[PDB]
Design a protein around this nucleic acid. Structure first.
Ligand SMILES: [Mg+2]
Ligand SMILES: [Mg+2]
Ligand SMILES: [Mg+2]
Ligand SMILES: [Mg+2]
Ligand SMILES: [Mg+2]
Ligand SMILES: [Mg+2]
Ligand SMILES: [Zn+2]
Ligand SMILES: [Zn+2]
Lengths: 218, 343, 132, 103
RNA sequence: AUAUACCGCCAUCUUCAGCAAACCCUGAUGAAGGCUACAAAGUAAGCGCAAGUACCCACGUAAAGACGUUAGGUCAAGGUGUAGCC
């Protein structure tokens, strides 16, 4: 029962892994996360996340941005502390190298290449009878190159897999569980997201290890 | 001659003629079918017309610690053994050809009220004993091709349920009937809809909806009312776990659209606790068996609202002239209230 | 489309043996001859007798070890002495096997006025080459 | 046995279980809705007819006023109104006898 | 007598390259469909093609040439289902 005790202890505490210290609206505005596509590229479900429009362009609400980002980071860190498998997706070729490298650095895995049909739904037939499909998915780019929702959000919502995607003005945050409005296209924003996620998951991991070592001592 | 004779498998093939034009094209034949038989399994190799007693194969080699010797089976016991073998073959043929009794569902030669048993166990290990299956509809779909012409494909629709508020429908297509059944069964056990219910035997409130030109109006009813609905609806309700309600289908009739709309409605119905948390008032039920007594159903989990709902006078509400007629009593129809079977 | 000593393709639930899966144009290329004699070579004779007798022997052995064999026979005639090789299943008893072995051996010897011997290899279940 | 100990007996439990008796019976009839009037009786001149009702096929059962836990299963525990013969599947003669017994 | 019961044996498109058990997905869970590589749902057992083998080579020629169509031919190579002479 002590295992369940340890699993439940972080729950009652809010910001228990201290994720809020990482991000600040200063940093977001510096990295140009507040940007958005034109009104022609605007999306209905993204309306409420738009702070306003200026010069046929869109601007994101940074309070909501920071709220959703705090929630996403807390969720990712809780799942890493629970050893829940994580998987990154970014179909954008502009950052595949960086994403794969940071995935290696974290220990968590990624898939930026072409997504094959029924990779997760028929994963048992593809890989083997027993395979632990990932417990958490994240998206640095929700839409594909030709700009329609990647198959991963759909199949994840199907198989009850949680999703954390950064949504630009073109993206549809309906299926996403923890959508973070932001700038999918800017390299500063990409690097910021990668640094935040790697720091958070590494903190969760090391906290798990030190706590379990303390309990082994006790 | 002995050389002209030949073995059994090709002989049975040529005698039965499963191939050829008969089987191809789906023409078949007029209900004549020779059933395969195996003669080698029946009689043991030892016996023949002249019954030499064989210590090697027919009789045990040793008796009383003494080697045996070849002997003759006289004609009396020879005829005895022959009659025994005749009786044994007759019993085998009887046991082979008998009745087949699949429980009568909606009607004979119909795959409606039949259950296929629980779904198959999963690869990782998932016991689905709780689930019961039913076949709602099956049809012979035909699509044409250049060389073979018409290509038949069995299409089937199935439903599965616990009896505990969780159920799901599915569709399967295959050239083989059993294969389509299996595919749809697996698809259903994978695709599940959950729906809440008021007191384990009813929906929360009346649901009227349309779906692909198929209108459905399902009406809540109290205990001991029975299930007076479409037969598919009765099967689905039996799967789900609700024991009594009413329903009327209007417009088109197509069981798959009917089922999809039914599940949409039973999923979109609102619970009383959720409704209380939404509105901010206490629910109050009044019965006919119980006198003027307010039975609290559910209260808002959040803070109660200070003001009550204003009485809605002459409300703008759309309803059905059919229900108006049934309430006013001027309606006449022999087909409305019948003494039908149990549910 | 030719039909000759080849099995029709099914959905994939037909166990088939090596030779029964292979076609009759793989005889010398990816198979061996079940019988071995010299009547087929040039200059010799009695080949018709060899063929008729080996067919008779195959039928007789199939019917005197019925339900236990799971493959075709192998015939090996070295000069005078004749040798047979079979593959069988362990269904019946060794008593049965040895008794019918001696029986058929004596029958062949007295019929052909020739020294005859036979060997048989047991298998738990028929060896399958492929699922057709 | 004329008394009701056949019900307490275990053969009743295994032959039926906890469900009622009528739940097992089913009627063979014309298409769609069945007729509104059941058969007159299941036995005639000590001759049984095909597909008889359960109380008539189980000759050990006895329609009696005193077998309360027996005959309570037709009338609904939720509603005092008896089920009708087209509902419970039994023939009209035994249904009338059961009405007299329950009254 | 029945090739319009068949096996066995073959012509045919074939001087083709498709046929596909078993899964997933789209179409509101309809018959049906599943292609974009600087990639958008297809994955694939197996058969066949192909490859390899034969003749003088790695080319060429043979051989092979699946699923199906012509109720294609063949109860007269042989046997056999049904119906007949017995
Ligand atoms: Mg009938
Ligand atoms: Mg040819
Ligand atoms: Mg023909
Ligand atoms: Mg050729
Ligand atoms: Mg080739
Ligand atoms: Mg013809
Ligand atoms: Zn963008
Ligand atoms: Zn009766």
């Amino acid at each position: 029962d002590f295992n369940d005790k340890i699993l439940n202890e972080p729950l009652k505490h809010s910001d228990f892994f201290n994720v809020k210290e990482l991000f600040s609206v200063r940093s977001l505005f510096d990295a140009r996360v507040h940007l958005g596509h034109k009104a022609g590229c605007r999306h209905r479900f993204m309306e409420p996340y738009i702070f306003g429009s200026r010069l046929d362009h869109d601007i994101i609400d940074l309070e909501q941005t920071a709220t959703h980002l705090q929630l996403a980071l807390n969720f990712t860190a809780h799942m890493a502390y629970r050893k829940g498998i994580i998987l990154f997706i970014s179909r954008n070729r502009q950052f595949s190298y960086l994403i794969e490298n940071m995935a290696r650095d974290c220990g968590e895995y990624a898939h930026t290449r072409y997504f094959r049909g029924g990779m997760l739904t028929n994963a048992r037939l593809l890989f083997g009878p027993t395979v632990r499909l990932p417990d958490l998915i994240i998206f640095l780019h929700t839409l594909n190159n030709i700009f329609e929702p990647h198959v991963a959000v759909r199949d994840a919502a199907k198989m009850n897999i949680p999703t954390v995607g950064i949504v630009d003005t073109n993206c549809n945050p309906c299926l996403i569980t923890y959508p973070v409005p932001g700038n999918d296209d800017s390299p500063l924003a990409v690097h910021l997201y990668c640094r935040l996620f790697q720091t958070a998951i590494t903190r969760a991991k090391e906290k798990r290890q030190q706590v379990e070592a303390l309990y082994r001592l006790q | 001659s002995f050389f002209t004779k030949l073995t059994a498998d090709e002989l049975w093939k040529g005698a039965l003629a499963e191939t050829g034009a008969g089987a191809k094209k789906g023409r078949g034949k007029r209900t004549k079918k020779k059933k395969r038989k195996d003669l080698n399994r029946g009689q043991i190799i030892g016996e023949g017309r002249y019954g030499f007693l064989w210590p090697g194969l027919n009789v045990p080699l040793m008796k009383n610690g003494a080697v045996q010797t070849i002997a003759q089976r006289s004609k009396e016991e020879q005829e005895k053994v022959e009659a025994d073998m005749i009786q044994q073959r007759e019993e085998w043929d009887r046991k082979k050809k008998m009745k087949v009794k699949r429980e009568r569902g909606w009607s004979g030669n119909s795959w409606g009220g039949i259950s296929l048993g629980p779904p198959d166990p999963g690869p990782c290990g998932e016991t689905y004993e709780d689930f019961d299956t039913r076949i709602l509809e099956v049809r012979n779909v035909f699509t044409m091709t250049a060389k073979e012409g018409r290509k038949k494909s069995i299409r089937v629709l199935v439903a599965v349920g616990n009896g505990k508020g969780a159920a799901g429908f599915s569709i399967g297509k295959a050239t083989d009937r059993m294969d389509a059944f299996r595919k749809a069964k697996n698809r259903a056990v994978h695709h599940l809809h959950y729906i809440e219910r008021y007191e384990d035997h009813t929906i929360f409130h009346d649901i009227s909806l349309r779906f692909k030109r198929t209108h459905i109006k399902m009406k809540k009813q109290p205990k001991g009312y029975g299930l007076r609905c479409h037969r598919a609806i009765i099967t689905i309700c039996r799967l789900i776990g609700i024991k009594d309600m009413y329903a009327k289908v209007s417009g088109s009739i197509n069981m798959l659209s009917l089922t999809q709309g039914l599940f949409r409605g039973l999923s979109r119905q609102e619970t009383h606790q959720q409704l209380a948390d939404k509105k901010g008032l206490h629910v109050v039920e009044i019965r006919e068996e119980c006198g003027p007594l307010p039975i609290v159903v559910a209260s808002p989990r959040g803070p109660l609202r200070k003001d009550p709902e204003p009485e809605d006078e002459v409300p703008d509400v759309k309803l059905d002239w059919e229900d108006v007629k049934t309430a006013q009593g001027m309606k006449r129809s022999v087909w409305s209230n019948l003494k039908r079977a149990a549910t | 489309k030719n039909r000759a000593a080849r099995v029709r393709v099914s959905k994939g639930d037909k166990p088939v043996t090596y030779e029964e899966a292979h076609a009759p144009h793989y005889i010398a290329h990816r198979k061996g001859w079940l019988s071995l004699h010299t009547g087929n070579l040039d200059g010799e004779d009695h080949a018709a007798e060899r063929t008729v007798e080996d067919v008779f022997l195959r039928k007789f052995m199939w019917g005197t070890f019925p339900g236990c064999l799971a493959d075709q026979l192998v015939l090996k005639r070295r000069g005078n002495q004749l040798e047979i090789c079979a593959v069988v299943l362990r269904q019946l008893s060794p008593h049965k096997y040895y008794f019918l072995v001696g029986y058929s051996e004596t029958l062949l010897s007295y019929f052909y006025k020739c020294p005859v011997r036979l060997h048989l290899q047991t298998v738990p279940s028929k060896v399958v080459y492929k699922y057709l | 046995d004329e008394p009701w100990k056949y019900l307490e007996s275990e053969e009743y439990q295994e032959r039926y279980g906890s469900r009622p008796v009528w739940a097992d019976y089913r009627r063979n009839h014309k298409g769609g809705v069945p007729p509104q009037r059941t058969r007159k009786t299941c036995i005639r001149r000590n001759k049984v007819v095909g597909n008889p009702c359960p109380i008539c096929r189980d000759h050990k059962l006895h329609v009696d006023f005193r077998n309360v836990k027996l005959l309570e299963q037709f009338v609904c525990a939720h509603t005092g109104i008896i089920f009708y013969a087209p509902y419970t599947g039994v023939c009209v003669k035994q249904h009338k006898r059961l009405t007299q017994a329950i009254q």
